[PDB]
Design a protein around this ligand. Structure first.
Ligand code: HEM
Length: 153
C-alpha cells in the first residue's frame, strides 16, 4: 500500500499534469508508440501513423491521450480504493482490446519518463518512487482481474 505521504506526492504532481492533459497525453502515447512499436499495432485507428511528426499532428491521437490521462487521474485520486473504476477497464482491455499486462508496464514507464521531462522540480526521486508504487498497485490490481478472466499477462 502507499502511505498518505506518498499519495500526496503522487496527487501533487498529477495536479500539474492536469494543467495540460492534452500535451501530456500526446507525449506519453507517442513515447509508448516509439519505444515499443508493437503497441501501436493494437490501434486500428492509429496504424497509419508512421512518423513522430504525423503522430504529433493527429488530433484524434491527442484526444486518446486525454482519454487515458482522465481515466488514470480518476483512479489515482481514489488512492487505492479504485475497485469500481478499475473493473470495467480490466474487462475491456483483457477481453476486448486484448492488451497484455506487459503493455501496461510499458505505458507506466512512458508516464514516468514524460513527468520527469515536464516537471523536473516537482518530480524528484521521492516523487518518482511514490509514482512508481501507485502505477504498480494499478497493474497489480488489473493483473488480478485478468487472471480471473483467463488472461493473466
Ligand atoms: C494507463 C492505462 C490505460 C488506461 C487508463 C486505458 C484507458 C482506456 C479507456 C478509458 C478506454 C476506452 C473505453 C474502453 O474501451 O474501455 C481505452 C480503450 C482502448 N485502449 Fe486503453 N487504456 C490504458 C492502456 C492501454 C494500452 C497500454 C493499450 C495498448 C497498448 C490500450 C489500448 C486501448 C484500445 C485498443 C482501446 C480502444 C480504442 C478505440 O476505441 O479505438 N490501452 N483505454
Amino acid at each position: 500500500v502507499l502511505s498518505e505521504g506518498e499519495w500526496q506526492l503522487v496527487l501533487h504532481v498529477w495536479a500539474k499534469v492536469e494543467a495540460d492533459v492534452a500535451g501530456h497525453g500526446q507525449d506519453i502515447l507517442i513515447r509508448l508508440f516509439k519505444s515499443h512499436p508493437e503497441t501501436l499495432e493494437k490501434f486500428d485507428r492509429f496504424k497509419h501513423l508512421k512518423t513522430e511528426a504525423e503522430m504529433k499532428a493527429s488530433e484524434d491521437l491527442k484526444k486518446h491521450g486525454v482519454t487515458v490521462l482522465t481515466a488514470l487521474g480518476a483512479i489515482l485520486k481514489k488512492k487505492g480504493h479504485h475497485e469500481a473504476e478499475l473493473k470495467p477497464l480490466a474487462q475491456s482491455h483483457a477481453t476486448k482490446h486484448k492488451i497484455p499486462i506487459k503493455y501496461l508496464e510499458f505505458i507506466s514507464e512512458a508516464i514516468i519518463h514524460v513527468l520527469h521531462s515536464r516537471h523536473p522540480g516537482d518530480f524528484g526521486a521521492d516523487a518518482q518512487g511514490a509514482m512508481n508504487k501507485a502505477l504498480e498497485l494499478f497493474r497489480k490490481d488489473i493483473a488480478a482481474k485478468y487472471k480471473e478472466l483467463g488472461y493473466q499477462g
